[PDB]
Amino acid sequence: GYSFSLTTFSPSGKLVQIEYALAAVAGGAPSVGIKAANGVVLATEKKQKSILYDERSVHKVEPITKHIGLVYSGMGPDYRVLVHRARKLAQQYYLVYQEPIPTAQLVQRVASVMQEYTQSGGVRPFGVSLLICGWNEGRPYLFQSDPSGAYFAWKATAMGKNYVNGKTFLEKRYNEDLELEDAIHTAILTLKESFEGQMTEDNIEVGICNEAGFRRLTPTEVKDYLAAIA
Amino acid sequence: TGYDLSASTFSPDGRVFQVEYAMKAVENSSTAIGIRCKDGVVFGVEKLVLSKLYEEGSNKRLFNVDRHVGMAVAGLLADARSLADIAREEASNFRSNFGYNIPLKHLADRVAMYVHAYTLYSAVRPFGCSFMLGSYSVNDGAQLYMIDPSGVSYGYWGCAIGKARQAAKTEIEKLQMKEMTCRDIVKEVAKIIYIVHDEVKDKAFELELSWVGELTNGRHEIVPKDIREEAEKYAKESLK
Amino acid sequence: TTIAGVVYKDGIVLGADTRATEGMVVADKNCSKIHFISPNIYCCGAGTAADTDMTTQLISSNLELHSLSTGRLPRVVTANRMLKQMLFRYQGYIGAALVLGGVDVTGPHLYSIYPHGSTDKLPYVTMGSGSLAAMAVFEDKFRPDMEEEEAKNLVSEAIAAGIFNDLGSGSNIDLCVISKNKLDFLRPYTVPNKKGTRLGRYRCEKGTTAVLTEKITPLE
Amino acid sequence: TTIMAVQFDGGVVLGADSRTTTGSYIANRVTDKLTPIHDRIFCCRSGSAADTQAVADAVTYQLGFHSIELNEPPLVHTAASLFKEMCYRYREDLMAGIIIAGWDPQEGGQVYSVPMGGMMVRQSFAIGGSGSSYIYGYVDATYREGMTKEECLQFTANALALAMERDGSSGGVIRLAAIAESGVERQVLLG
Amino acid sequence: SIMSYNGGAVMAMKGKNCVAIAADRRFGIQAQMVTTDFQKIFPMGDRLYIGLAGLATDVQTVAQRLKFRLNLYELKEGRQIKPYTLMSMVANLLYEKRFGPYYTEPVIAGLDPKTFKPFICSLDLIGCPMVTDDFVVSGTCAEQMYGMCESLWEPNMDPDHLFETISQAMLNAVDRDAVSGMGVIVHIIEKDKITTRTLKARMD
Amino acid sequence: SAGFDRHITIFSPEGRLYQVEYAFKAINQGGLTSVAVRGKDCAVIVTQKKVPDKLLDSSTVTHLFKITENIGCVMTGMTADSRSQVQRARYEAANWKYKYGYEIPVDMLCKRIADISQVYTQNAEMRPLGCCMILIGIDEEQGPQVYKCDPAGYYCGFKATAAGVKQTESTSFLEKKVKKKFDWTFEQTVETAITCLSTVLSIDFKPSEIEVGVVTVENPKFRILTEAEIDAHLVALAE
């Protein structure tokens, strides 16, 4: 019975309310994202609870600009909040500099926002881990954040249920050199490793990032591609 | 029994115990009823003298909020005074902004939002009041509303607030309420208040009756109760 | 400065002339006066240039933000409401003479904005200093529901008359055509005024100017 | 410029020119000078344009929000009071010649006038605009108490015709509006 | 005018693969000069300078403010700055004082950080940019430098004739000008090297 | 578990927070049932009333709250949260109408209400408004819509929709009923709504207890039915 709340350190350890938010992230819906040579592939795992829900209303894959994709693994109600913050911030950058914002500067400022919520002492942290990507100046990128304010840079990663198992498959399956199609193939493979047995044109939801810009794929080509891709 | 401390927190079964405890605070307060007729709304409050120290004409729970609206409060009196001032302020804003008399639905909704806003946060407590709101208009008829301590505000024909909440409406509802003008309803409310608690727990009480409708041409004031003296010459005929 | 707008049978054809004068001297011969708002809505500015520029970039940012939050194509009336509310909020201090045009789901909609906040929906507008000549050509030869090349010839003719009247431009009149599906944008449309060829050669020589102090700094 | 509103027994009838000018040049030849706020209540404007447009938008906001919260159709005197407050509060900055008219279920057809100052009065007929002085010259000559709809239409037609004919700023085209218990009837006349 | 309080003239000219910027040396109050070594062309990164003309207060103030924001940008991002980005930055900095305006006419001349593409632009006193291909001018004297550069400019210019063209233009337009004179400084830059020469102008 | 006694809005171990999943049955203290159905170019709300008193009125017990002229809603849970949420919805729809010049689509309104509930959830020292809201409306190029807003700030929206007390059973009947691919010709919708509530609650009662709110692409105005036509539909499904 301690820590409680956000203003004071432990006797020796860490920030238990951030560790619990990370556990709530790890208890979330799975996702996978892979940086290839020319593009970046994002893929989530979106199961409706009943047969009643519609798949055209809520969207996991969400663009920040015309060339910057972003998925998560956590809670949509906080996700939309920090999405809207990132929207307004990226449009403020484009007001200041009249140039589309680079992804490193996005990740700096979004990390500053999340860090400002981790400061004391009445607000809770986000239960949201991001996977940010974009194609700025030829070389595409991939940046994962976390509730603690930190950030990383990945070649391919995963987040959600069985991220450890999916990551051990990613270490074996993926490599340095692929194209976007082979990236989607290995991405649906590593998401199909951990998802339920019935995977359709609606249970997944996939957006890509070519150098020609962000592209959020449709259920038509998603159903064409995952119609027993291997 | 918890977890009953703050007004922001929920329970393991999902309700706010602060609101319940504030609701049953008014249960110990004096009995106050109300009923409307086809051309007016009549109030009536069982009011008690402490022992012999009062003046029969102090601290009247029958307030007078707008030109055609008044309260029939019961519970903590000063909280009701502050809430009456807020209601006067809201009717003031409406009269200043739109040039005509406030409809009672809109007034009741603003007051319900104000009471709900005092039930929301953790710094403040919920109100300890439960009051009545009556009105009359030439294009609207008679309207009688009702606000609980929580902030649920809807409409009635008759109501009761106090100890005998059920024990008044047991014989309120056997009144032929539609076909009567309110001048009968005056002595009707007199007999209803006079039925409950003559001498049993306390020693003596005293009656006030408020009065709005078409007969006042849209005004709201206390009856000249001494005029027509309708309680006692019928109260002494209501014991048998 | 002479900008114009029109509505043909499907969409909107806008024109402009690109002489950005600073006082009494021609300071520019090529100034993009047709500004971006959205993939379907565009805007033109007149009068104070930087006011029109900053305002149209702010409103384009706000509509990009709203459209990406919503998830569908923007409406022209929202842009109109933001612009008139902003310009009334500045009380007519900012001089920004705007022409607003776009094609929604409802179709083509043209608005002209006067810098206090007075707006109008019109089939054809002219704005600027030499707007009167283009409005002359419009009032002479306009008919409702023209075709494409007809409307292009009319707007080109109007801005050409504005150039043959005073304070037009040397420039090769800029046009832009918005339809329900097809957006086009044409900078070097028609060049009437070629620069006269040099008759000699006022070229300097390697050393015709006395030099007092040199410096060399290498780089990478 | 020249705006006009005449009530009768069943409802009210409005009317205006269009011809919004700036100085000596006509900026716009045809204009919706009269503005719907609610489905049964109009206002017609004059003076400066941006002032009346912003005021009409905010009044549309407040009146729509209030009448939805009542869940009842609004009054005309309500909208007149709203225009009175917003005109009077910024008389230092606004130039509004707002004239309110509209049919009401409780009170029938009504006409209110708010001139450049910010006062509010109920009248049976109203003028407005810089070129309204002339038909204000003979509106106390030709008017008869208790007209029909067609008599009001012919009356305002002759009125706005002569106002457009005489004043230099006035002109353009005649717009009419007929508001009653039945419906809203707008039409575009010339003659 | 207020622009003619301390004088000033800045010329920038785009060549074939290189760009040349030049300015005057005179500093003084309305008719009384003080010194001949007042700096108006500042280094903003590599192969990119800026020139400022008008009131000297706004020259040094906006130059230090811009250096502040420039170093903050180049430290937040390890790369160096593109010239359009700098142009937009100066536009935002000037437009923040929409009603409190500086009295300056900034001129940006620089190369591409990736390629050898030259770049010139100029701004107004509220932040109105203007990109051209031949030359931009600023300061008190305008029509002189417009007449000279519209007389002498060629599209494809070796850096030597570029230097001589901007030299003759600045010398004649300054010698005709009254309040701006007393020497000329010239920066002629390219991908390989950076050259700064001072000319023997008339000290009258 | 707790342990931590879940007094404020923090994260507990493994891994949830208990305040919102206590707020999810503040709906369940309402004692009330709501069903929404979208089949075709119409949309139907149905919700009963629990009035034991003859002294109590019948008009002002209405839960169907006409948000705007083309958007309706129904509320369950506690009444004060519901009515305050409704006035926030009306205020923000009017704010849309003022700012953007046209009528709000029902999606953005649910997004804005969800965001308000999330801000009430993100910052502490405020109760998280324990009521659930179902919206309906007609939109051009999309037909009718049915949406649900959570007290947590989790909006969603879907074909056959139900929230309140007994709606595990209602969604069980709506899985066992919206699986056959027939069209829904508006009396199919009214009949399935009345009979789904009539199988969940199993009452088969007078036309004076339920409230029916409909919207249709023939009259896009929100419309509340009358006792006569409610009785007409009820005996029209009486075989």
From Swiss-Prot, chain A:
Q: Which InterPro entries match?
A: Ntn_hydrolases_N, Proteasome_alpha, Proteasome_alpha-type, Proteasome_asu_N, Proteasome_sua/b
Q: What is its main location?
A: cytoplasm
Q: Which residues cross the membrane?
A: none
Induction or repression? Down-regulated by antioxidants BO-653 and probucol. Down-regulated in response to enterovirus 71 (EV71) infection (at protein level).
Tell me, what is an example of a GO biological process annotation in this record? Answer: response to virus
How is the protein altered post-translationally, as described in the entry?
Phosphorylated on tyrosine residues; which may be important for nuclear import.
Pfam families xref list: Proteasome (PF00227), Proteasome_A_N (PF10584)
Asked whether the keyword Cytoplasm is assigned, the reply is yes
Q: Which residues carry this modification: Phosphoserine?
A: 3, 10, 12
Superkingdom of the source?
A: Eukaryota
Of the GO CC terms on this record, one is: extracellular region
- UniProt subcellular location: Cytoplasm; Nucleus
Family annotation (SUPFAM superfamilies): N-terminal nucleophile aminohydrolases (Ntn hydrolases)
Kindly state which keywords UniProt assigns to this record, in alphabetical order: Acetylation, Cytoplasm, Nucleus, Phosphoprotein, Proteasome
Which parts of the sequence carry Phosphotyrosine?
A: 2, 20, 72, 117
Q: What residues bear N6-acetyllysine in this entry?
A: 66, 167
The subunit structure is: The 26S proteasome consists of a 20S proteasome core and two 19S regulatory subunits. The 20S proteasome core is a barrel-shaped complex made of 28 subunits that are arranged in four stacked rings. The two outer rings are each formed by seven alpha subunits, and the two inner rings are formed by seven beta subunits. The proteolytic activity is exerted by three beta-subunits PSMB5, PSMB6 and PSMB7.
Family membership? Belongs to the peptidase T1A family.
Write down the NCBIfam families for this protein, in alphabetical order: PRK03996.1
Please identify the protein, giving its name as recorded: Proteasome subunit alpha type-2
Which species does the entry assign this protein to?
Answer: Homo sapiens (Human)
Swiss-Prot record, chain C:
Alphabetical UniProt keywords = Cytoplasm, Host-virus interaction, Hydrolase, Nucleus, Protease, Proteasome, Threonine protease, Zymogen
The record's catalysed reaction(s) read: Cleavage of peptide bonds with very broad specificity
Query: One GO biological process from the UniProt record?
Result: proteasome-mediated ubiquitin-dependent protein catabolic process
Compartments reported by the entry? Cytoplasm; Nucleus
Q: In which tissues is it expressed?
A: Expressed at a low level in colonic mucosa. Up-regulated in colorectal cancer tissues.
Q: Does the keyword NADP apply?
A: no
Indicate the enzyme's highest-level EC class. hydrolase
EC number from the UniProt entry: 3.4.25.1
Active-site residues, Swiss-Prot/TrEMBL: 1
Cellular component, GO annotation? cilium; cytoplasm; cytosol; extracellular region; ficolin-1-rich granule lumen; nuclear body; nucleoplasm; nucleus
Classify the main location: cytoplasm
Entry's Gene Ontology molecular function annotations? endopeptidase activity; threonine-type endopeptidase activity
Question: In which domain of life is the source organism classified?
Answer: Eukaryota
What is stated as this protein's family in its record? Answer: Belongs to the peptidase T1B family.
Which proteins does it associate with, and in what oligomeric form? The 26S proteasome consists of a 20S proteasome core and two 19S regulatory subunits. The 20S proteasome core is a barrel-shaped complex made of 28 subunits that are arranged in four stacked rings. The two outer rings are each formed by seven alpha subunits, and the two inner rings are formed by seven beta subunits. The proteolytic activity is exerted by three beta-subunits PSMB5, PSMB6 and PSMB7.
Q: What is this protein called?
A: Proteasome subunit beta type-7
Native source species = Homo sapiens (Human)
Provide the gene name from the record.
PSMB7
Which part of the full protein is shown?
44 to 263 of 277
Swiss-Prot record, chain D:
Q: Which UniProt keywords apply?
A: Acetylation, Cytoplasm, Host-virus interaction, Hydrolase, Nucleus, Phosphoprotein, Protease, Proteasome, Threonine protease, Zymogen
Q: State its Enzyme Commission number(s).
A: 3.4.25.1
| Domain of life per record | Eukaryota
Spans traversing the lipid bilayer: none
Give the CC-aspect GO terms: cytoplasm; cytosol; extracellular exosome; mitochondrion; nucleoplasm; nucleus; proteasome complex; proteasome core complex
> Which molecular function GO terms apply here?
cadherin binding; endopeptidase activity; threonine-type endopeptidase activity
The reaction(s) catalysed by this protein are:
Cleavage of peptide bonds with very broad specificity
Q: Name one GO biological process term.
A: proteasome-mediated ubiquitin-dependent protein catabolic process
- Active site (catalytic residues): 1 (nucleophile)
Localization, UniProt:
Cytoplasm; Nucleus
Family listed: Belongs to the peptidase T1B family.
On assembly, the entry states: The 26S proteasome consists of a 20S proteasome core and two 19S regulatory subunits. The 20S proteasome core is a barrel-shaped complex made of 28 subunits that are arranged in four stacked rings. The two outer rings are each formed by seven alpha subunits, and the two inner rings are formed by seven beta subunits. The proteolytic activity is exerted by three beta-subunits PSMB5, PSMB6 and PSMB7. (Microbial infection) Interacts with HIV-1 protein Tat.
Please report the name of this protein according to its UniProt entry.
Proteasome subunit beta type-6
Task: State the organism named in the record.
Answer: Homo sapiens (Human)
Curated annotation (Swiss-Prot), chain F:
GO cellular component annotations of the record: cilium; cytoplasm; cytosol; extracellular exosome; mitochondrion; myofibril; nuclear matrix; nucleoplasm
Which residues, renumbered to this chain, carry the PTM Phosphoserine? 12, 58-59
Q: Which InterPro entries match?
A: Ntn_hydrolases_N, Proteasome_alpha, Proteasome_alpha-type, Proteasome_asu_N, Proteasome_sua/b, Proteasome_subunit_alpha6
Q: Which UniProt keywords apply?
A: Acetylation, Cytoplasm, Glycoprotein, Nucleus, Phosphoprotein, Proteasome
> Which residues does the record list as N6-acetyllysine (modified residue)?
97, 99
Biological function: Component of the 20S core proteasome complex involved in the proteolytic degradation of most intracellular proteins. This complex plays numerous essential roles within the cell by associating with different regulatory particles. Associated with two 19S regulatory particles, forms the 26S proteasome and thus participates in the ATP-dependent degradation of ubiquitinated proteins.
Spell out which residues are annotated as carrying Phosphotyrosine.
154
Could you identify this protein by its name?
Proteasome subunit alpha type-6
Give the family this protein belongs to, as stated in its UniProt record: Belongs to the peptidase T1A family.
Q: How does it assemble?
A: The 26S proteasome consists of a 20S proteasome core and two 19S regulatory subunits. The 20S proteasome core is a barrel-shaped complex made of 28 subunits that are arranged in four stacked rings. The two outer rings are each formed by seven alpha subunits, and the two inner rings are formed by seven beta subunits. The proteolytic activity is exerted by three beta-subunits PSMB5, PSMB6 and PSMB7. Interacts with ALKBH4.
Recorded source organism is Homo sapiens (Human)
Check the record and name the NCBIfam families matching this protein. PRK03996.1 (NF003075)
